[PDB]
Subunit: 232 residues, 4 copies
């Protein structure tokens, strides 16, 4: 059972398992039920931009989500990630659709990791090549002709499908801590396009971190964002 730290743009309120009454960004520490959430002023059809940061000195995983010239949405959570995640991990983006759907388009994805014990891993994508050998595409994750990472299924038309799960891991494992390490930090940006024919888009996109061999958990569809085998 994978260890998971995710920042969720939870498109779909699932009150029956923790979610607030509304679209929200959440910080998930080994549970789909977010340790912290903020009301996310969704804007379907516009391009969102998530920034994620954290160092091991401040011990505060923080995420902001924004649209151009629009009021942003921040959510923080005091956590020491080296007590949660293994020493080595892989970073990725996941997204699902349930009975309700939405395009989970990733227009770009950067991520910087620093381990001053000064080791480092930076990577950024503004274009997603047809064959991304530096990405372990899991489930329904693919890349379209516009150089966009489609995390979840989308017809040739552009319409999103439902009951789809897909994630993109960066091929190289990251080293986010070492007993010796004085400070391990990481940042993570990505822009996304969420479009939906439904007035209740679902289910969400997330940037997560996990055991290197992390794979899509069975039953992880929909409100589970392809991160957990259950809702505990």
């Amino acid at each position: 059972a994978d260890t998971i730290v995710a920042v969720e743009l939870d498109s779909y309120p699932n009150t029956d398992i923790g979610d607030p009454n509304y679209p929200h960004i959440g910080i998930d520490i080994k549970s789909i039920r977010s340790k912290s959430t903020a009301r996310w002023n969704m804007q379907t059809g516009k391009v969102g931009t998530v920034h994620i940061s954290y160092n091991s000195v401040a011990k505060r995983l923080s995420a902001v989500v924004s649209y151009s010239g629009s009021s942003s949405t921040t959510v923080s959570y005091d956590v020491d990630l080296n007590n949660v995640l293994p020493e080595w991990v892989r970073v990725g983006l996941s997204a699902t659709t349930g009975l309700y759907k939405e395009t989970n388009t990733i227009l770009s994805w950067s991520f910087t990791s620093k381990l001053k014990t000064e080791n480092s891993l930076h990577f950024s994508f503004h274009k997603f090549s047809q064959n991304p050998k530096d990405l372990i595409l899991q489930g329904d994750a693919f890349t379209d002709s516009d150089g966009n990472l489609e995390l979840t299924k989308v017809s040739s038309s552009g319409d999103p499908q439902g009951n789809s799960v897909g994630r993109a891991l960066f091929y190289a494992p990251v080293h986010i801590w070492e007993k010796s390490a004085v400070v391990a930090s990481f940042d993570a940006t990505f822009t996304f396009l969420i479009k939906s024919p439904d007035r209740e888009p679902a289910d969400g996109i997330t940037f997560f971190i996990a055991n290197t061999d992390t794979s899509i958990p069975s039953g992880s569809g929909g409100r589970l964002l392809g991160l957990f085998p259950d809702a505990n």
Copy 2:
């Protein structure tokens, strides 16, 4: 048969297959016989520092090697790497020993890759963890307790062994070009410690680039620097 672009710190003169009469840095385009070389003022026992750069606009692979406060050694070569290397590659460091030996210690290794079509892959190591999951260690390559990448065999004493070959690839494939790409560049630094009981150290260390599935070619020992199956 792998495609190979390497920058060699050729410790050992092998005149009988191209090498100059002396220790030298070479730029190898799909051949152990360097398209360009410069006389390398070796300093066994001191820590060297190779810087490598190249963009696709200038089309000039250049490398400099230096010791602290000592006269450096530069070597350049006009080449268009996208006509040589495949679209996707893996970057690494190799080193061998023949009948003559030497420690092939890598104290650090950074590498930045930029694909403005602005995609990117940066990674740097000042410490090499006991288990580097973000490095495909090939052959005799291992990491010692001092956090140093030993490319080639070295007894517990510290003495180097001979007839050893070892390389370190970064786990993630790099994208160094795209038909669309306007400019693909990359830099690569690394510091090394070459020590030898022999007054004729051998055989050398190299930073190379290759087809992603690049592996140590049979017969690639010694003067082949674990890069080629032959000397053509």
Copy 3:
């Protein structure tokens, strides 16, 4: 460049690169141009059955192809496979379509390997599971709902597409020889269904053997049966 030993059911005559004037079974030793061929009495729409055998004592790779109660077609070739193939290999089935097409259905596939130095590897498939984890499916190779290995593309209708290449490797590398080995033999059976709307079906199906890391060579489509990067 992979080492390849294949037994080809060459559906399509390609005279301009060696092929006989007619559909034929060929034995290919590191070349699409068969060292031996026999006239293959094709029967599109009926289920064929290839048996392949060889031991290192007799040094005779032999293949027979048959349809129920129909005159079979045998082809032999005296070769010592341990002088051709590496010590370790992977066994598989490949098939392509060019401008002309055909279904490349594999209804079953067994293979026995014996290394008396008595080591062994047997595997047989009468059903191909939706997710064959014990098969490295390459290119357009997939498995349909009838439990059939579709080597090459086929519409939902059942019509075959063209310019498609796909192979199925057995996940485990086989050990087909050892310097010590007294006798290494192997057999290989498989039944196939070739159907075509075209009166000139193309291009063929093959059981091949190759370096373990064998992958579909670029330009290997059509008359190359997804085995060679060229016709030499």
Copy 4:
């Protein structure tokens, strides 16, 4: 957390976690505490021979262990393995040493798997090649010059070391059941040589079956036989 079905030749009594008072063979269904055990008349220095069988109709995992012309030791357990193990698995041999040690030599290892829904996977080893590419060697598992699989560490002298863990998985995943399958069976033989300077040899050898991605669990040393992260 891996799913594990093992047949243990538990060299070392660990009463404080279930073990009988004596060396024994056990059948472990997702727990180091055997669902069934029989008193194992150990014979250190002689070559043992374990036979394992099971089909899904009888639903009885059975194992026998024997030495030449010596009273054997049988242990059975009524279990339906398709309710325990995933649909796809990898089969292997594991062994550890704790504060007490012993050579865990595997002189041979066969295994037949049949899935009549008649699919099959057979493999046998009487010799273990220096580089067994068809074996995922985990931990301290290696192969010596006599063609023997040393599961656990052994000095050049031949003396076994302690606190060592090593397993050998067959490279190809096995298909041990399918919803459709009418009967899935498997057999598994292997001969072993257990030698110890200690009058209380430890800890044991096992043939196990697990989720394909099974790896040595942390803390699985000694009485855990490199199968479980704990003793529950």
